[PDB]
RNA sequence: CCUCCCGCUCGGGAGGAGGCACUCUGGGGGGACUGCCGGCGAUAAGCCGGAGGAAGGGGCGGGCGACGGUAGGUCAGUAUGCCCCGAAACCCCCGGGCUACACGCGCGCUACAAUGGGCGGGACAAUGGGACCCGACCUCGAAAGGGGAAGGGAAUCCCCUAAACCCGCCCUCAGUUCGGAUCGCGGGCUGCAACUCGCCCGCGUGAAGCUGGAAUCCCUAGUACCCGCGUGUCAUCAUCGCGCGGCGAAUA
């Protein structure tokens, strides 16, 4: 068989993925892909897996562990890594360029994540000032 | 039930412990934990007045004492902050604070 | 061919809560829904399901965790209390529905207290579950 | 169903609506929304159905769980007033007992000459602090208890 | 022999690394088996403070860092092979803790 | 819950929100073709960051554009499952997360009556809700005019979707029109150009006041 | 006349009046309790010798 | 390899051996510089557009604020010229006052419901703080809390549960099951002591408010908008100040 370990990181959901051959296993943090309640962020994970095909999804075991705060955050870290897990597998430029033309959130993360809350002039949030009315 | 409690007299004979089940959470606490060394010199001047050595008109800065059944009858002088305001203590005053009855402000109209 | 891991938590909970009516060892005591309930409820419900879900969770949680305490399962529910116009804050549930529940499971043989100081599953609590999940995971492929 | 009505009378002659049993009693002063669902249990009814679907026989089961609730069950913190005026153990409160018991204790303080009774006469919260400018632009809290 | 832990922290970066490196160099050659100098966290300490003593207008607010870094070292040597290695000069200002177990 | 999972087998294949094929519709006008993300795929939430570039906002999934101009109204106050709200408004004093549900249920409530691919009723409601002409109180040379200004295909879309999203919250106001409904009954009637769309009443008036002034 | 000593003798078990600094000798003004009891104003003057860093 | 469960015997999951791969931790190194390509520009400076690429043309966010001025602000933090007090404008003490209100405004929180409420279930973080201090876990108590007690001066233990989310169920748009003021009572907790003047828990009580005139403020992207989370100071008053991550735009 094989072991190709990859990563996928979006807004600090770090997905730890492994792609070995088998029988159609989809593991997320220990639980099948079935346990999630929002239908929505599931479909996001599902986007790459059809762009390539069910053929390669069925023939390969994917276990990922996404330690990330967001529900959509987890999903997004799962969308970037499967796509990178499937481009290392087959090896061709056909599956890589087909992802890039569709969206760059499969193969690029961000350049940025979050900004600090500025000291500010005694109010709440990074970018805000106390209200004025002294004119 | 006219007169607060079982009867005015039976709550002078139940003092420590048996009153407690009747009282608020707040009055219990200050009896049960105890009160300060000025509250110990106020147990001589209620006792000089009910009997014996020449009675002083009882004065107090005690506004954290909650009225008991033995102290019902005396005319208590509670310093409002400037001067002493009198209160004739009743059996309907069992279970309230002593600093309620004397004022914490002069009582006038606002404007 | 199934664990509590393989079944969604919306289909698992009415299948274990029924299997807590049926067996029929765990039951509602009368004092626990009446007015000894968890924090504030907009209404108090007169449900068997109410008791059978607060316990059907307890057999899933001790599976995942080791030393799962009373102070953990009181704080694990999710729910608040008003202070006023000051915004709400995070408080914990009623320890009465959690300290009788573990003990209704403890007499049933589903949960046991370990000698390290804590709460773990027995084999009888672990098999009661894997059978109820083998029935749920089998039905989830039949149904489009 | 158990014989449709739109107005059955519960708790004396005061009226039970067609909203829901748990909300129809809340109105009846003394029975709230948590205390309504404590007397649905003892009596043996479905709580979530409409009000007015009651024969004559259900209306008698509620009026005797009200007169003395501390006889049927109802814990000694889950009943309306526990430990009353220093010598009643527990009682019930209803539109006539609640109105009288709260004006009595207020009649008691004014004679006592306290800082609670005259603070309910001038127009003020006692422990809520600010009278500084709240109830602002001519406004008013309405203190206790009803401007509807 | 006696497995010793040298747990060595310092308030600044330059002072902590020189000692960690020197401790792994001198101990290497004698009667010592030594496990490598492992870096644990910086419990960076934030003091977040009001500049202005008026507390007036806009007041610009100082962010403070105190960063304290912790290297850890297991070693298999005697209590006599330990002092030989604890000879070293050490920056001001570098805390060196020693637990001793067999 | 079982239909829900069929809604997970079906978007896979590929379809929006679980059961709307993105091929059902076409953009017949060559104006609104590059300005619309009908053609690309699956999820709005995306977080693909826009306004990054000059037209970093044209490539926005039509529905995502819907979600956040449908999310708009919002201050200060605090939401959580507690007792707790409003704080997420008559238009998300809060997130695109519980926003995306509203638009999904509004695609469900507009599919239930019309029975067409709802992405053929909304893309038929954002080519009609946009006015073709606007007057700006524009002065140039110190001389105050109120002038013929024609509208650009990007600034069209925006006035289409925003007027659709502004009309519904006047109606949902403390009313049985739920935004999942109040939007679904705005999107049908902006597609039609009906006399009941607070979004096709400004479209017209903004062209008609702007014709007088020209 | 004659009387017994005074150097204050009342309760000051806890609060701000319990504290004083080790540089400007105050009760109500700031007392940073990390084992560095000073006011906020001293703190700013003292820190570069402490080894704190301005940079965020 | 080994212990436990389940099984359609194909196969799913946990523990410990075992293994440092991965995440991560903190120390160091490379990578972006208009380098290249086109267009505009005096072939210069520079601006625009393009390719490759994780990232681009101040990459992005902070700290970093000259000579001075408003006689701005503070001698009520300290330092200090001058003046004034001297059983006092000192000193000690208890109690009261700063928390008084017919009202006016500023800055904010909470809020006028179906994008909703109850109930249940399930999937998810980060900064931090923790010795008379964080407190596992076990027990009693409806709960607030009390009794017992492990670990922890810290990547190794604890606060700790994230919240928003979603799925099913009950409920079916009224000043209401909204909203929580006000008042009665029962009860805990700290301190000598919370009436004046603390917070929470339970039952009863259940006020204004059903989208707000003139006028006016804040901000330009991982930002605003939104959701919780921690810390400071610290017994206790936080709808505050500082700071963290989760969802994630409009227009320019």
Numbering used by the authors:
A (entry chain K): 1 to 135
B (entry chain T): 6 to 116
C (entry chain U): 1 to 144
D (entry chain O): 1 to 148
E (entry chain L): 1 to 102
F (entry chain H): 2 to 215
G (entry chain P): 1 to 56
Quote the study that presented this structure, word for word.
However, archaeal translation initiation uses three initiation factors, aIF1, aIF1A and aIF2, homologous to their eukaryotic counterparts. We isolated two conformational states of the 30S IC at 5.34 and 7.5 Å overall resolutions, respectively.
In IC1–PIN, the initiator tRNA is positioned in the P site. The density is consistent with the interaction of the anticodon with the start codon on mRNA whereas the 3′ methionylated extremity remains bound to aIF2γ. Indeed a bending of the tRNA molecule at the level of the hinge region was necessary. Notably, aIF2γ moves only very slightly in IC1–PIN as compared with IC0–PREMOTE and remains bound to h44 via its domain III. The remodelling of the TC is accompanied by the loosening of some contacts between aIF2 and the 30S subunit such as those involving the long L2 loop of aIF2γ–DII and the aIF2α–D3 domain. The inside of the L-shaped tRNA, occupied by aIF2β in IC0–PREMOTE is now occupied by aIF1. The observed head movement is similar to that described for py48S when compared with 40S:eIF1:eIF1A, and corresponds to a clockwise rotation around h28 of about 6° from IC0–PREMOTE to IC1–PIN. This suggests that aIF2 exerts a spring force on the tRNA adjusted in the P site, which brings back the tRNA in the ‘remote' conformation if there is no correct start codon in the mRNA available.
